[PDB]
């Protein structure tokens, strides 16, 4: 039974924690408190093969880098998350992708681009613009909402498929 170490990266506030909790625990966190755990695990079936998802939820604050850059070497696939109502977080995708390629020392790292908060009306990042950037990187692009769970399973499952394709 194969285990996949998935790393969720992105700027502060894009919903890295909310996506991980919605996937693992099936509820949306917002106003109320929550217990910190960082490491989340789940058994899933993807394309008829049962596997274990080991998800690392990193912090967006760049002053805390001993938690994110340390585990960039251990991660097998990366969820690069921006929020569709946060132009700066979309711009920052380039910075996270370069940091990953530097640590992994590879041009073909399993990655999925994720535009979160697609339930909100205040969009400032066009879908076609993010599709164009993902095409430039050669990676899938998935729009998600941790609030409604739209696209959440697809984003993490697509990353696993990228990892499986890379391991051939
Ligand atoms: N409307 C909406 N709000 C969302 C969505 N995902 C997250 N949020 C909200 O956005 C805020 C930040 O979410 P959070 O998961 O803490 O973001 P983060 O990327 O883990 N932040 P950090 O980098 O500081 O750890 C919260 O108020 C959360 O409820 C979404 O899909 N839709
Ligand atoms: Mg968080």
From Swiss-Prot:
SMART domains: RAB (SM00175), RAN (SM00176), RAS (SM00173), RHO (SM00174)
Effect of residue 5 to N: In GASC; found also in a patient with Costello syndrome; exhibits only minor alterations in its in vitro biochemical behavior compared to wild-type protein
Gene3D superfamilies membership: P-loop containing nucleotide triphosphate hydrolases
Example of a GO biological process term: homeostasis of number of cells within a tissue
UniProt-annotated binding residues for GTP: 10-18, 29-35, 59-60, 116-119
Residues bearing the modification N6-acetyllysine: 104
Effect annotated for changing residue 59 to T: In GASC; also found in bladder cancer; somatic mutation
Signal peptide per UniProt: none
Record's catalysed reaction(s): GTP + H2O = GDP + phosphate + H(+)
Membrane topology: Lipid-anchor
Keyword Lipoprotein in record: yes
Cell location: Cell membrane; Endomembrane system; Cytoplasm, Cytosol
Name used for this protein in its record: GTPase KRas
Provenance organism: Homo sapiens
């Amino acid at each position: 039974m194969t285990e996949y170490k998935l790393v969720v990266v992105g700027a502060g506030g894009v919903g890295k924690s909310a996506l991980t909790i919605q996937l693992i625990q099936n509820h949306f966190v917002d106003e109320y408190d929550r217990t910190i755990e960082d490491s989340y695990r789940k058994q899933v079936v993807i394309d008829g093969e049962t596997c274990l998802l080991d998800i690392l939820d990193t912090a967006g604050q760049e002053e805390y880098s001993a938690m994110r850059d340390q585990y960039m070497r251990t991660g097998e696939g990366f969820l690069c998350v921006f929020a569709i109502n946060n132009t700066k977080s979309f711009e920052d995708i380039h910075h996270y992708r370069e940091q990953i390629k530097r640590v992994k020392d590879s041009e073909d790292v399993p990655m999925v681009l994720v535009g979160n908060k697609c339930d909100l009306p205040s969009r400032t990042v066009d879908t076609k613009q993010a599709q164009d950037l993902a095409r430039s990187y050669g990676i899938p692009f998935i729009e998600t909402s941790a609030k409604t769970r739209q696209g959440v399973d697809d984003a993490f499952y697509t990353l696993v498929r990228e990892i499986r394709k890379h391991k051939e």
